């Protein structure tokens, strides 16, 4: 019936300023296209969720590395 | 052998072309769905809905099928 | 295959499969409530298709006459 | 000595509901008299086996056409 | 999920002395919206201390917490 679902969605409004040490990263998630701003959510090994700017190269590198090492 | 099982449906497509080297597999969505759809499965097991009428989508599906 | 379950189709694909994806075909049992042809893709997908459609009949013929 | 052999025999319990395209047929076989139902097994060019009812007209014709074209 | 439009912890000065590592229970990176960068260390008695992210012992502590989780 409706166009969108009634479950809350994770969106990024502010990103981390500095590059996270890559050996801390456990996984990644892409934020919904519904969000006003584009965003990658990094999941650390200590299970923290950190918002990252997908326009930054280290963010793109990390995502690529996670995909190509799965 | 699953039965009375939920069906994957796409209600929106990605507007961006996914990096092809991320793709691990693909699935056509059921004709019972309102919209046509191809679900790409990344190697990190992410799932992205894509428009089957798009050329790059058709190309990715072709490459996956013909390289099996 | 003694008392094994039989594959039946309850919904067909709405889009014609590109023929160069087709690896094999399988007819469904006449015991099924609906007619059906199961196409096997080269990536080993099993897809239900409507036997009343010409392209389905054509694909099966081509698989047959090339065997 | 036994009355029957201890090798399994092909029996038709359910037939096909629709007539096979004749140009798919490669061969035919009559099912054993030991079977509960009479049956003709059509060997398809892609090595498929299809149970057909020998009472139906198209089945009888196919068999005849096969034998008379050998 | 969790509450929103909530205040954010920010550091405006760092501890001049290294914290004994066996006191450390957890660490927290301060928001990029804060005027200064910072790592908040949480002791086992829930004391909160701001530390300079550029200092070596701070980075070691953060690493040991992440890599052992």
Swiss-Prot record, chain E:
Task: Note the site residues: Involved in GAG binding.
Answer: 17, 45, 47
Instruction: Give the consequence of mutating residue 47 to A.
Output: Reduces heparin binding
Top-level taxonomic group: Eukaryota
Does the entry annotate any disulfide bonds, and if so which pairs?
10-34, 11-50
Name under which the protein is recorded: C-C motif chemokine 3
Organism from which the protein derives = Homo sapiens
Gene encoding this chain?
CCL3
Entire-sequence positions represented here:
24 to 92 of 92
């Amino acid at each position: 019936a409706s166009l969108a679902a009634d479950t809350p969605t994770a969106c990024c409004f502010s990103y981390t300023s500095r590059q996270i040490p890559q050996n801390f990263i456990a996984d990644y998630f892409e934020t919904s296209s519904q969000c006003s701003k584009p965003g990658v959510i990094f999941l650390t090994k200590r299970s923290r969720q950190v918002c990252a700017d997908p326009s930054e190269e280290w963010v793109q590198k990390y995502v690529s590395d996670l995909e190509l090492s799965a």
